[PDB]
Amino acid sequence: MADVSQYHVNHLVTFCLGEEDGVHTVEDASRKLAVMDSQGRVWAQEMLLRVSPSQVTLLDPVSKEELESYPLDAIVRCDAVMPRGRSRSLLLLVCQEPERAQPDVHFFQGLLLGAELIREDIQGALQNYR
Amino acid sequence: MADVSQYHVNHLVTFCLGEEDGVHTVEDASRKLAVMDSQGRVWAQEMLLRVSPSQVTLLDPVSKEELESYPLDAIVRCDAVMPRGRSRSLLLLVCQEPERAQPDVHFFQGLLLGAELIREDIQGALQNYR
Ligand SMILES: [Ca+2]
Ligand SMILES: [Ca+2]
Numbered sequence: 001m002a003d004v005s006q007y008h009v010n011h012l013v014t015f016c017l018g019e020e021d022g023v024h025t026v027e028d029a030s031r032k033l034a035v036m037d038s039q040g041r042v043w044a045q046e047m048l049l050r051v052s053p054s055q056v057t058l059l060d061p062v063s064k065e066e067l068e069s070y071p072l073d074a075i076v077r078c079d080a081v082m083p084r085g086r087s088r089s090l091l092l093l094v095c096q097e098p099e100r101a102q103p104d105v106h107f108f109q110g111l112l113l114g115a116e117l118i119r120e121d122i123q124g125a126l127q128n129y130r
Numbered sequence: 131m132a133d134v135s136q137y138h139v140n141h142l143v144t145f146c147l148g149e150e151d152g153v154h155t156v157e158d159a160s161r162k163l164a165v166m167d168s169q170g171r172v173w174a175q176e177m178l179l180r181v182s183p184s185q186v187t188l189l190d191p192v193s194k195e196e197l198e199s200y201p202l203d204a205i206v207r208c209d210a211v212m213p214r215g216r217s218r219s220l221l222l223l224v225c226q227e228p229e230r231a232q233p234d235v236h237f238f239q240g241l242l243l244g245a246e247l248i249r250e251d252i253q254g255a256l257q258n259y260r
Contacts (some may be wrong), residue, residue, distance in 0.1 A: 014230050014231065015146075015231040015232065016145075016146035016232065018146075036231065045228075045229070098175075099197075099198075100144050100145070100234075101143055102145065102146065
């Protein structure tokens with residue numbers, strides 16, 4: 001428990017989810033992440049992920065300026081997963097931003113704190129908010 | 131000419147552009163906007179669009195808080211268009227955000243100032259920046 005916590009993570013990829021792309025489960029999403037990675041579309045970018053009781057914020061690790069923010073009302077799902085062929089956990093966040101026609105899948109690689117700890121924190125903040 | 135100007139607009143829709151969706155031209159995009167609208171996916175939301183010499187910013191018309199921002203380096207195209215069956219101009223902005231796997235199309239309805247005036251301002255700011 002902490003109202004505001006931060007974690008350093010590496011953002012790996014954000015991609016839109018359409019009703020006809022065949023991507024329906026966390027597992028389908030991890031598989032599309034591995035395809036993307038084999039096409040040279042995934043490049044790790046270090047970021048600061050901040051969970052507060054009203055939103056999840058992403059910041060530049062040095063400048064501390066806000067790169068993106070998702071109010072908790074915009075998060076539709078948060079999971080942590082270890083795809084086949086990886087010793088690590090990925091943090092998956094699906095958001096439906098109000099202005100966008102489709103939801104997006106965001107994948108993050110956790111560093112020392114893993115994705116499981118961040119998943120519990122966001123899910124605790126979601127339960128609370130909701 | 132003005133380094134920073136603002137315009138009130140209505141955001142209509144933002145959607146991702148994929149290499150296999152058949153959407154290649156401004157005209158294809160206006161047609162997909164009309165399909166979306168006939169599926170009940172388009173709802174006008176009033177916003178403040180600000181052009182500065184380093185970025186395009188979208189704000190809530192009252193609270194003035196930033197809703198989104200696109201550094202000029204992220205804009206790949208800006209056009210104004212009058213689709214068939216409309217007496218008005220739409221402002222089209224295509225952006226490729228660094229973190230996203232695909233570019234997005236954003237459509238805005240201009241109000242009293244039209245989309246043509248905003249297109250020239252962003253294109254002037256793009257030329258300058260570039
Ligand atoms: Ca917490
Ligand atoms: Ca200007």
